[PDB]
Ligand binder design. Structure first.
Ligand code: HEM
Ligand SMILES: CC1=CCC(=C(C)C)CC1
Length: 137
């Protein structure tokens, strides 16, 4: 289920974080506008870059903590508020988070593995709802 999926992802988090984030940027090329320094790069070029591996892994370190603190795929309001307030997210709207979770769910569906993709899709929906509620447009 969802909790085991957190353990699976954490067991190889650098790899999953890069692969899911690349799935997100390739599915929604226009999202490269928030990361201007990733433009005109192949996947292998991005994985060679410092900011890419470090930043993507830090995103997923926190995403897994938010997942782990959730009840029935419903995140804490405090985790939602942190995500909205962060200076690094000043630009963003719920659509940015929408798209990241569509890509994550698709990645899980396509994987060889028994991910609980339905639980991640509900988690994404519930996080978008919590971000809206905490003041993201
Ligand atoms: C649950 C989802 C997400 C989590 C947990 C999360 C978490 C984080 C964390 C921890 C950082 C700081 C990392 C660092 O400075 O090394 C960060 C920065 C950032 N995040 Fe997010 N993030 C999420 C979703 C998004 C989405 C959907 C976008 C854009 C579409 C985004 C854009 C950014 C940007 C642009 C930065 C700063 C740019 C940079 O790294 O130089 N994040 N996020
Ligand atoms: C905070 C952050 C850092 C790195 C990212 C990558 C896509 C490498 C985006 C999110």
């Amino acid at each position: 289920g969802f909790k085991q999926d957190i353990a699976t992802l954490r067991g190889d988090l650098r790899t999953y974080a890069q692969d899911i984030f690349l799935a997100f940027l390739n599915k929604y090329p226009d999202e490269k506008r928030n990361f201007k320094n990733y433009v005109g790069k192949s996947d292998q070029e991005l994985k060679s870059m410092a900011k890419f591996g470090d930043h993507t892994e830090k995103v997923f370190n926190l995403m897994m903590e938010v997942a782990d603190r959730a009840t029935d795929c419903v995140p804490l309001a405090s985790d939602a508020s942190t995500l909205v307030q962060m200076k690094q997210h000043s630009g963003l709207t719920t659509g940015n988070f929408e798209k990241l979770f569509v890509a994550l769910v698709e990645y899980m569906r396509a994987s060889g593995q028994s991910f609980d993709s339905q639980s991640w899709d509900r988690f994404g929906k519930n996080l978008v709802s919590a971000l809206s509620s905490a003041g993201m447009k």
